[PDB]
Design an enzyme around this catalytic site. Structure first.
Site, mmCIF file in Angstrom:
data_model
loop_
_atom_site.group_PDB
_atom_site.id
_atom_site.type_symbol
_atom_site.label_atom_id
_atom_site.label_comp_id
_atom_site.label_asym_id
_atom_site.label_seq_id
_atom_site.Cartn_x
_atom_site.Cartn_y
_atom_site.Cartn_z
ATOM 1 N N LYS A 90 28.749 35.227 36.663
ATOM 2 C CA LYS A 90 29.689 34.686 35.695
ATOM 3 C C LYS A 90 29.183 35.034 34.311
ATOM 4 C CE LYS A 90 33.509 32.067 35.690
ATOM 5 N NZ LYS A 90 33.345 30.609 35.405
ATOM 6 N N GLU A 102 39.971 37.453 36.549
ATOM 7 C CA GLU A 102 40.481 36.233 35.937
ATOM 8 C C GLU A 102 41.629 36.430 34.956
ATOM 9 O OE1 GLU A 102 38.625 33.410 32.648
ATOM 10 O OE2 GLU A 102 37.521 33.178 34.539
ATOM 11 N N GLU A 130 29.650 26.304 40.948
ATOM 12 C CA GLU A 130 29.069 26.981 39.799
ATOM 13 C C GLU A 130 27.843 26.327 39.181
ATOM 14 O OE1 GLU A 130 31.363 27.630 35.854
ATOM 15 O OE2 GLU A 130 31.448 29.543 36.942
ATOM 16 N N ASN A 168 42.640 30.898 35.530
ATOM 17 C CA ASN A 168 41.857 29.941 34.767
ATOM 18 C C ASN A 168 42.727 28.904 34.067
ATOM 19 O OD1 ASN A 168 39.806 28.620 33.420
ATOM 20 N ND2 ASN A 168 38.821 30.502 32.695
ATOM 21 N N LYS A 203 25.167 26.180 36.011
ATOM 22 C CA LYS A 203 25.029 26.478 34.597
ATOM 23 C C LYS A 203 24.355 25.291 33.932
ATOM 24 C CE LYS A 203 29.811 24.971 34.037
ATOM 25 N NZ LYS A 203 31.197 25.452 33.799
ATOM 26 N N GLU A 247 40.626 28.174 38.930
ATOM 27 C CA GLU A 247 39.421 27.935 38.137
ATOM 28 C C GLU A 247 39.510 26.899 37.028
ATOM 29 O OE1 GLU A 247 37.653 31.631 36.546
ATOM 30 O OE2 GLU A 247 39.208 32.688 37.662
ATOM 31 N N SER A 248 38.410 26.165 36.864
ATOM 32 C CA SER A 248 38.214 25.187 35.796
ATOM 33 C C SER A 248 38.926 23.833 35.765
ATOM 34 C CB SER A 248 38.446 25.885 34.451
ATOM 35 O OG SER A 248 37.720 27.107 34.384
#
Length: 254
Positions: free
Chosen positions: A112, A160, A51, A181, A53, A214-215
């Site tokens: 995203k 998600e 990802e 997530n 960002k 995720e995350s």
């Protein structure tokens, strides 16, 4: 149809309502050819969706970096897909970022953002995204309608979920690529046990599609535990903060 965002709590709620206020349909180009997001993730072993960002709401400390250079580094490092933040107020992203990355790499891209209007899906597909993020915490029971709209547009979706209740919604909507997530978008609190727990439940409930964790991931050992259950993992901040993106990613792949 727009989802009722009046009761969405915390940070998630604030970000979503702001996006809803700036949604304004404008002329879009015809959709270009794009690779399959799902297919790339089904390759052997745990697939990494890297990802890009410029800003991290949860951890911050993201130094000056270019989305394109990061995307190119990710690809060379073994990423199978790239997630591009296009949310402008908290992640410092923009749709332009998606367009730029699209021109630079061949990997399938995930837009995203916080989809609160069907136009955002049409927009994502029109500019080269293979898939768009759909957050059940935002869409609620309208998740199925949005997923179908994506299908009609020839767009894939990373559906998600963060709770058992949300998971069921995603499963009934016919999600093909389902993400769990570990981060609570309302409080920004992370719980790495969430992905494994709900991922297991998804398989038990008969989910045969692509499972994405995720995350909060930062080291290979955390990924090792996901093997045999998840098809992919989405990782951003731990990479964006590393001295060399490609190197940090290579170590995550092993």
């Amino acid at each position: 149809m727009r989802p009722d965002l009046s009761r969405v709590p915390g940070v998630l709620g604030e970000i979503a309502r702001k996006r809803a206020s700036e949604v304004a349909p404008y002329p879009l180009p015809e959709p270009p050819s794009v690779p399959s997001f799902k297919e790339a993730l089904l390759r052997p072993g745990l697939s990494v969706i890297a990802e890009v960002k410029r800003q991290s709401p949860s951890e911050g400390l993201i130094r000056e970096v270019d989305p394109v250079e990061a995307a190119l580094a990710y690809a060379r490092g073994g990423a199978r897909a790239v997630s591009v933040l296009t949310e402008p107020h908290r992640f410092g992203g923009s749709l332009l970022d998606l367009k730029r990355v699209r021109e630079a790499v061949d990997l399938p891209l995930l837009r995203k953002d916080f989809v609160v209007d069907p136009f955002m899906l049409e927009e994502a597909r029109a500019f080269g995204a293979s898939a768009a993020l759909l957050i059940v915490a935002l869409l609620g029971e309208l998740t199925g309608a949005y997923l179908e709209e994506a299908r009609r547009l020839g767009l894939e979706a990373l559906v998600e979920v963060h709770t058992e209740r949300e998971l069921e919604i995603a499963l009934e909507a016919g999600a093909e690529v389902l993400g769990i997530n570990n981060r609570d978008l309302a409080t920004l609190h992370i719980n790495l046990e969430t992905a494994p727990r709900l991922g297991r439940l998804a398989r038990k409930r008969g989910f045969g599609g692509v499972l994405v964790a995720e995350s909060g991931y930062s080291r290979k050992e955390e990924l090792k535990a996901l093997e045999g259950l998840f098809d992919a993992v989405l990782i951003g901040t731990s990479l964006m903060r590393a001295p060399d993106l490609e190197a940090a990613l290579r170590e995550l792949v092993g």
